[PDB]
């Protein structure tokens, strides 16, 4: 349910390539979409031999989802993961070097909230970091901005930082607000969390 | 467990002097993993001090060190390097070479060189 | 400095015996993240990998090595003590500052 969220996520972005990710940083799930055909999923972690994945299948109507979950003992960080998807002829499909702490997807954050300032008349947004998730400190933010009829702007929020004030929007027109997550740690990576639930404010006029 | 880790450049040297360290690596892909300096004071416990990402583009000290301590690698020659300025008393411990594994554990050992600052 | 993570500074068995060695940090290390390991040490000798990932083993580590974590302190447990098991043993956590940090570390005597 969670899982199957943010890989759609994952899919809208870049649908040919092979696509993985972490949540906790001790699991790992690639995953490619295809238009059923058979593949061989191999890893090699650190120095170890290479290893064999139970490759997962199934329709999403018609393309069809392979997926492999790696075992939670071969979920280290801080070293390479070399993966290499075959297909059943001997040809190549997909060839990655990726590190799993350089992975991670976090859930999108909550509670976002749009409000006026007492006399000043611009907007303050504030949200709560993904829900059941550690080292909050770390997470740095994006929030979306846009107007109605025809139109985005984009303000980045520095980590640990969970709120923004707005300045320079347009009198009395409608603004919605989103803000998305994602790792900004240092030895960390990842991609963008899904946008939060938006949230609308009317602006006082100029 | 054919790795091996061979430190060098230790000594002894005067208080505010300085010191060039040297770990030789082989036995791995020495490129693709973090690498780390580990300090022990005589009769002391084990003190973290640097970390360096496998290409060098992200260094971390703790704290009694950074503006005197500067961490490097040659992944051509698979070789760590400390230099090591300014050099106080309480830098006075063997420095071993680490090497950085699963989970950010140090997997394989050096030996230590030491390195002795006394007037 | 950055304070290590609190060990008992020294715990002794019997041989057979079990013994338990804590590692206790905050939410801002051990508790905040999988990324601890145990390491032993034998007087004149180079710190040796026992535990790494909580409670993961190395390839040539015995069984009677066993690691945990509970909240913000780490333990690491020896069973069937043996004579050979006397040494130091230190904790090492990641940390939210970027850090790694070890523990005071730990003198096993055996009876």
């Known amino acids: 349910p969670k899982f199957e969220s943010k890989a759609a996520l994952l899919a809208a972005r870049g649908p040919e390539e092979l696509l993985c990710f972490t949540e906790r940083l001790e699991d790992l799930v690639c995953f490619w979409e295809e238009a059923p055909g058979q593949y061989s999923f191999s890893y090699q972690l650190e120095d170890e031999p290479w290893k064999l994945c139970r490759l997962h299948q199934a329709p999403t109507a018609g393309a069809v989802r392979f997926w492999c979950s790696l075992p939670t003992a071969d979920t280290s960080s801080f070293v390479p993961l070399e993966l290499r998807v075959t297909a059943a002829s001997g040809a190549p499909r997909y060839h990655r070097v990726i590190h799993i702490n350089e992975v991670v997807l976090l859930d999108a954050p909550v509670g976002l909230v749009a409000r006026l300032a007492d006399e000043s008349g611009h907007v303050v947004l504030r949200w709560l970091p993904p829900p059941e998730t550690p080292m909050t400190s770390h997470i740095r933010y994006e929030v979306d901005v846009s107007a109605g009829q025809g139109s985005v702007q984009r303000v980045e929020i520095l980590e640990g930082r969970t709120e923004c004030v707005l300045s320079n929007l347009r009198g009395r027109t409608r603004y919605t607000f989103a803000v998305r997550a994602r790792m900004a740690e240092p030895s960390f990576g990842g991609f963008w969390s899904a946008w939060s639930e938006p949230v609308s404010l009317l602006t006082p006029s100029d | 467990s054919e790795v091996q880790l061979v430190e060098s450049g230790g000594g002894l040297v005067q208080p505010g002097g300085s010191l060039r360290l040297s770990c030789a690596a082989s036995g791995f892909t020495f490129s693709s993993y973090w690498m780390s300096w580990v300090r022990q004071a005589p009769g002391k416990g084990l003190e973290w001090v640097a970390n360096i990402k496998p290409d060098g583009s992200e260094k971390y000290y703790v704290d009694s060190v950074k503006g005197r301590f500067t961490i490097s690698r040659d992944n051509a020659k698979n070789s760590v390097y400390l230099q090591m300025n300014s050099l106080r008393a309480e830098d006075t411990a063997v420095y071993y070479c680490?090497?950085?594994?699963?989970?950010?554990?140090?997997?394989?050992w050096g030996q230590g060189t030491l390195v002795t600052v006394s007037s | 400095s950055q304070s290590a993570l609190t060990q008992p500074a020294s715990v002794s068995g019997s041989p057979g015996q079990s013994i338990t060695i804590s590692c206790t940090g905050t939410?801002?290390?051990?508790?905040?993240?999988?990324?601890v390991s145990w390491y032993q040490q034998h007087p004149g000798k180079a710190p040796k990998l026992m535990i790494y990932?909580?409670?993961r083993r190395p390839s040539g580590i015995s069984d009677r090595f066993s690691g945990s974590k509970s909240g913000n302190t780490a333990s690491l447990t020896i069973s069937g003590l043996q004579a050979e098991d006397e040494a130091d043993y230190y904790c090492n956590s990641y940390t939210t500052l970027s850090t790694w940090l070890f523990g005071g570390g730990t003198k096993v005597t055996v009876l």
């Open positions: 990932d909580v409670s």
């Open positions: 680490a090497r950085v594994s699963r989970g950010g554990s140090y997997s394989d």
């Open positions: 939410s801002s290390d051990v508790g905040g993240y999988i990324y």
